[PDB]
Amino acid sequence: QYVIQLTSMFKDVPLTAEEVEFVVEKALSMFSKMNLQEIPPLVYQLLVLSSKGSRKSVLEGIIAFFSALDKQHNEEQSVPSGELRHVEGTIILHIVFAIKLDYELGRELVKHLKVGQQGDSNNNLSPFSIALLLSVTRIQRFQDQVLDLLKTSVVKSFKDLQLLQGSKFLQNLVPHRSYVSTMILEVVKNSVHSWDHVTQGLVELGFILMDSYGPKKVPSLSRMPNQHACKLGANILLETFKIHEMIRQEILEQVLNRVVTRASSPISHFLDLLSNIVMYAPLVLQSCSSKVTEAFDYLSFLPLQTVQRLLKAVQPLLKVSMSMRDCLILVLRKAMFANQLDARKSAVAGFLLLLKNFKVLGSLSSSQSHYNSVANETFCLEIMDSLRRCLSQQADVRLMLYEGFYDVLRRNSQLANSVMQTLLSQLKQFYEPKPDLLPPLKLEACILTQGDKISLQEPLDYLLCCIQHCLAWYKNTVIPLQEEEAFYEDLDDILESITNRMIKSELEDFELDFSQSTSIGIKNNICAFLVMGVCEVLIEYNFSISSFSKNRFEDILSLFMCYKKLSDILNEKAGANKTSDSLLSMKFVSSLLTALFRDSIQSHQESLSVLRSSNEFMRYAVNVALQKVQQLKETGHVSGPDGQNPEKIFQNLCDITRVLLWRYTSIPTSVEESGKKEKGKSISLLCLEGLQKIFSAVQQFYQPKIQQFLRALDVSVTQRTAFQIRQFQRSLLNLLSSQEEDFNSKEALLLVTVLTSLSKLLEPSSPQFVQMLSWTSKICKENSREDALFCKSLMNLLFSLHVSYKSPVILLRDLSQDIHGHLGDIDQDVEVEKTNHFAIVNLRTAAPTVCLLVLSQAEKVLEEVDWLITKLKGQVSQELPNQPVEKAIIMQLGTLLTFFHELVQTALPSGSCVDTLLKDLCKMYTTLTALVRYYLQVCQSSGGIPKNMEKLVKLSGSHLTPLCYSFISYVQNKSKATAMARVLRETKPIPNLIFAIEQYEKFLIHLSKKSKVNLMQHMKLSTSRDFKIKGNILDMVLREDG
Amino acid sequence: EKTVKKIEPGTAADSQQIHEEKLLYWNMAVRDFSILINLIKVFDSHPVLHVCLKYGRLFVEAFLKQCMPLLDFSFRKHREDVLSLLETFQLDTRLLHHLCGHSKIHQDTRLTQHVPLLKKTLELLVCRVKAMLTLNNCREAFWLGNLKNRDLQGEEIK
Amino acid sequence: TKIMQLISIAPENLQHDIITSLPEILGDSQHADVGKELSDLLIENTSLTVPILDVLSSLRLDPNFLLKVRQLVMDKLSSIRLEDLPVIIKFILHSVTAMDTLEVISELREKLDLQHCVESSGQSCIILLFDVIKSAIRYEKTISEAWIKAIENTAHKVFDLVMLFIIYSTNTQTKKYIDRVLRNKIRSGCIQEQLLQSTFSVHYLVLKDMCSSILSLAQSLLHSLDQSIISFGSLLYKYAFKFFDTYCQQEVVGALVTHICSGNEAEVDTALDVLLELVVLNPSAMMMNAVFVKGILDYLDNISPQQIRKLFYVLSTLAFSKQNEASSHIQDDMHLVIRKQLSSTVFKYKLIGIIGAVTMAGIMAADRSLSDEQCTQVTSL
DNA sequence: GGCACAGGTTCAGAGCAGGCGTTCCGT
DNA sequence: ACGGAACGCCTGCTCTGAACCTGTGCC
């Protein structure tokens, strides 16, 4: 090594021709043999000698050597030592000082590593290269440029992963070595070894990525490029916060600096990041007491959703700082009288959350505790007095209050002794004491009568809802767990009286049998909603306390009949108004469904015979289940209790799934035997609606517990779901083999939607996917029903399965002959018909419906093709495994050209379909131009051409090239300010097609010039058209116009 | 190209006294464009037809952008003159297509550079003529035919 | 009834006290009737009008009732002192619907009293106005966007320009949009040069709270190659240096040294010219700025020889503008480093050193129509 | 015979790529 | 002597969501 050092010292004189060879050959020689500790001195020698010139020649060598060392470590761990990282920490610092010394070096470095196109990276990135880029991000000049580079690289990589997961053809062709997302995670893991300069780069990259692509509308084009990418940013904001101790005190301020400030756009990802960091290590929040303190002053001017997670996050801080608690309660009580509605709702939610979290040490029931127990007690009681002030306010505050009292009672039991009394006071504000009196609700006091408008004041249905849930909780928990008990049974008596008077009630009391036209109708509609709500809450109560008594269930039936006629009257008034999220609790809905269908006990059956005698209630139970699942679709929370808990709601949802599936399975449609008015509204159709909705929701939300979900519904999940897809398949086969004149199209399309939703669960390589593919092929080839939507859904299912199984191009070609046979031809001198390919195609549905779907799938495979050839151009730019890939490309284009050649003679209807065909033709010829462009780069270097693309070019010229011009002529020949927009819209694609074709002509001419083969002889001359005007039609139309 | 580009299209609300001399100037411009274009044959050299391709696509693009709204506004009032100048531009378009075919036949990168955009704008003028017929409630009058591949001297080729 | 009895009978101080205490005393129910009755008092009396405006801003009333007081008070907005104003504009900004934003914004911008109004209480009131505007703009998005739309429709007032600066500072979403709007405005020529000087004269104290934002704005504008935008940026930089305290005078030079280190020809030329006129304006502030000239001298390689021809001009001028120990230790180290650069036999280092040394010698030797010691020193070097 | 349902059409905005522009080098 | 190539700026392409309306199917 002394020879290396003295030669390096002697080479300090300025030389270029021999110096570059000496430094690069010595560099690779020392990379191949030298010890690890001697690398950093050699690194210093080579980087200081390279300052004279030939910087990038040594830069590529050293970065490639460290990448190779990283891969060696990766395969070794998959000798290992911590010091392997530490020496790199000594190395990287010095070279970035060289980047600080020499700016042109950094300029050429960031210029070369720019991702010029999607394949130009070709995994040039690496953990060491990412660390170098982040260190460059430390320097201010290239900070924005390299940050934009990293952001674009992450977006491109996420798009590449989305395309790779979107089809198995790329998986068969391309390796799965493409990843930059896990690269940054590996860099974060490696930063444990004393890489502190890197941390600034990580936080800056994370913040720019997080705030760049966050949601703003509250994105299928950029679903994974944007949303998942934000999660990656969020992920690293977690990961560094777990690892680097010193940066923990920093990043939180930036988060707060966004969270209080950016109040307009959604900030939900930052909220979830804040919750996860404070949950992991709340102690750091003690450090930023000043920041949260100045944040609390803005609580009157934040969204409520920010306030919920922020106040949930700051609770460990509140457990210690009593002065900060006093300041918080001061700003809350000062925030009570703010006229802003959001400020009031925010303050009340903060009240409920904080009193929920402070545990009363005396007799509170378990969990899911400051030593000053009496201080906690008096604090909670004065907070309850503030709530007594709160309750007399506008309707939304009251609604939130009654929604949150159940969770308050669950996490804090002693305050119930006040809360119910407070609720009882509200009950005493509306419940008349005399049982002789008919109503339990006064419409005047219930509604906010006011000048020139009408609005809600206090939802009494929600009062009864909260009272019922609190009373049921206490009766179920505290009394069995065990001077002032009497009010409990008094409440029961109150509800009992509210039951009785209600069944004896009628529409005459409430003045019913009314819309937004007049205030009278507005208050009548609001009263209708209120009586419906309190009636169904009375159904909840009576079903709860009865324990299956005949008289109680008779009361339930009469009460529900009252509710049903109220709902029918409201619907007749409507014939926005109908949509009302019913107050039925999720646990009660599950229990009601299970009791209704699955029942064996004779004492239960005696009452349930009377209950089930009305099919209206049977429809209503499944209907409220549908409404609950549809509510769950848009958000995890639900209207009833236990909205926050995902485990509880999911475990309860399994019961309704299995019960409803049993209902549909064990009961055929013949058992219904109902009239045609309600046959469409038969409970089987509603059951299939619910099955479709829930099977779309379940894997969307509860991904990890799918195995337990399917196990509880009734080994590998494939063998498990084989059973369910088999029963659904048998039901579909029975339905589709029915009478040909008519069939339940709604039932069929719901069922095939259920098949499509459940099919994605299957592992593609298992035999179950093969069975589903074969059965779908049989159904398509054997059946032909007159319904566009049914055929469209079956085609979408078939393609979604097939693309996973293999490339769809053979199916494209086989469907091409069928569509060509069914539709016809533009010449009217050639006859074609081959109907045996797929009987599902039909002359009544082939043109408008099937053609759009098959063209869209064609466009998808061209998108895959142009991505792949772009990566080929990228690896060409990088520098013979590509031959089979090229052969696959040529085969795919050949068969899809055959598909085009078969369809293009067809006389499609004039409209959007021909426009999609023209656009997809443009896409095809542009991909061909890209293909010959790729050939231009490689064959010019090689000096010769293989024999495949020649066959492709000749078959393209024989099949499609003049046929395009003939079809364009047919398109114009096929005759029929606002219309100007449509006329200008329908003017582009026909020129665009010939532009693409001629572009291909130009590029293949260049290819012939640069490869010494006259490929133009294969293709014919560009036929071109000229317009003509029929003077006789002009004379006729002008004469009749005149 | 500059002179034809600078002239703006008169609106439909403009009187026919302002439309008529516009159409007369347009007819003169297309006529002298035709007699200028027909001088290519005498000199079949590389740079002259090379510049002719680029400036032909520029000229027809400008004609498309500007004249066609005037034709849309003033078809009924001046139908016969519109058809006459359209026929003259049809002759010019035939000459342009023949030049395109000659450029394509002779394998030459520089000549073929300006071909695809030329054919795009020419075809887009054809579809704009179809749009003009559609706007005037005479879409059925429109018709198409295939144009023979004649070389520069005016003789068909295989 | 009790509150109105106290209003009627009690004197000015007590009635004022119960009025400013009104939102806490009243519950939810009595908002509308009490609002109508205090509007009747507004019609009756004028002295207690401002506290009534305050509680009307605080209390919950519908827009339809607010319309009457808005119509009554908009007439008198042009004829109220500076001490009254911020709570009135607080009412106006927080008592407007979604559709009335542009109208009231244009009307209040037209009826501004600061032009004729502009002691220490006055400047305190002005920052109170700006704090009220910061509170209103930060969350009332429709008002924020309507401000830019209204001034874009208007297409010159200093108060509007300061509001534009703070709007750029606060709302991150309007960053690129307001940058483009400012570029369009200065390109149009509506923004004259004297109003910048008057703005920095009247609102120097307020502008410090977002001086970082104005430095970022001028830094963004430096990249633009338009001559008008470049002159605008130089004017903003020199005014910010000459008006603010030593703090912003330090961050401005800290930004300018990085701009010089960027190396772009337009940016480096503009930065050097700004630095030269800055040193001309007030070398006393620049005397404290010592590390920045050292950092300038360190990166000799990026700066081109044409720029180096006048780069040494500024440092030599501020060194030899006034004799001081500050100048002494600013001169000895630069003299040593250029001497050792010349000592190096490399032609590039010799070229940079000689170009620096000739300008240094000329600048120290030149004077208007110099002791014997100075003559000996310049001859010796 | 008209309602309620749905898919089509239209749109304005967000966001970005090639192709012009210019310069340098190969041809 | 001439052209393409390269790369910064810009227009104008492409999608996207939503509102909006007619047409359809049915009571």
Residue numbers in the entry:
A (entry chain A): 172 to 249, 259 to 398, 408 to 557, 573 to 686, 694 to 724, 729 to 790, 797 to 935, 949 to 1113, ...
B (entry chain B): 1243 to 1400
C (entry chain B): 194 to 311, 336 to 372, 377 to 590, 602 to 613
Sentences from the paper on this structure:
The Fanconi anaemia (FA) pathway is responsible for repairing DNA interstrand crosslinks (ICLs) and ensuring that genome stability is maintained when replication is stalled (Nalepa & Clapp, 2018). A crucial and central step in this pathway is the mono‐ubiquitination of FANCD2 and FANCI on specific lysines (K561 and K523, respectively, for human proteins) catalysed by a multi‐component ubiquitin ligase (FA‐core complex) and the UBE2T ubiquitin‐conjugating enzyme (Lemonidis et al, 2022). Removal of the two ubiquitins, through isopeptide cleavage by the USP1‐UAF1 complex, is also required for ICL repair and maintenance of genomic stability (Oestergaard et al, 2007; Kim et al, 2009; Murai et al, 2011). While FANCD2 ubiquitination precedes FANCI ubiquitination, FANCD2 is also deubiquitinated at a faster rate than FANCI, which can result in a FANCI‐ubiquitinated ID2 complex (IUbD2).
To address these questions, we used our in vitro reconstitution approach (Arkinson et al, 2018; Rennie et al, 2020, 2021) to assemble a 1:1:1 IUbD2‐DNA complex, from purified IUb, D2 and dsDNA (61 bp long), and subsequently determined its structure by cryo‐EM. Our final IUbD2‐DNA map, made of 139,601 image particles, was at 4.1 Å global resolution and had a local resolution ranging from 2.8 to 13.9 Å. Interestingly, IUbD2 has the same closed‐on‐DNA conformation as IUbD2Ub and ID2Ub. The overall conformation of the IUbD2 complex is very similar to that of IUbD2Ub. The most noticeable differences are (i) slight movements of FANCD2 and FANCI helices in the region where FANCD2's ubiquitin interacts with FANCI and (ii) the high level of disorder in the FANCI N‐terminus proximal to that region (residues 1–170), upon loss of FANCD2 ubiquitination. We thus propose that the high level of disorder in the FANCI N‐terminus is a direct consequence of the loss of binding between the ubiquitin of FANCD2 and the N‐terminus of FANCI. We reasoned that the relative disorder in the N‐terminal regions of FANCI or FANCD2, in IUbD2‐DNA or ID2Ub‐DNA complexes, respectively, might be crucial for ubiquitination of FANCD2 or FANCI, correspondingly. Despite the slight movements of IUbD2's FANCI and FANCD2 towards the region where FANCD2‐conjugated ubiquitin would be, FANCD2's K561 is fully accessible for ubiquitination, when compared to its position in the ID2‐DNA complex (~80 Å2 buried; Figs 3B and EV3). In each case, ubiquitin's hydrophobic I44 patch is involved in interaction with the other ID2 subunit; however, the ubiquitin conjugated to FANCI forms a more extended interface with FANCD2 (Wang et al, 2020). This extended interface is formed predominantly via hydrophobic interactions of residues H209 (α10 helix), V243, P244 and D247 (α13 helix) of FANCD2 with residues T9 and K11 of ubiquitin and is further stabilised by hydrogen bonding between ubiquitin's T9 and R74 with FANCD2's H209 and S251 (or E217), respectively.
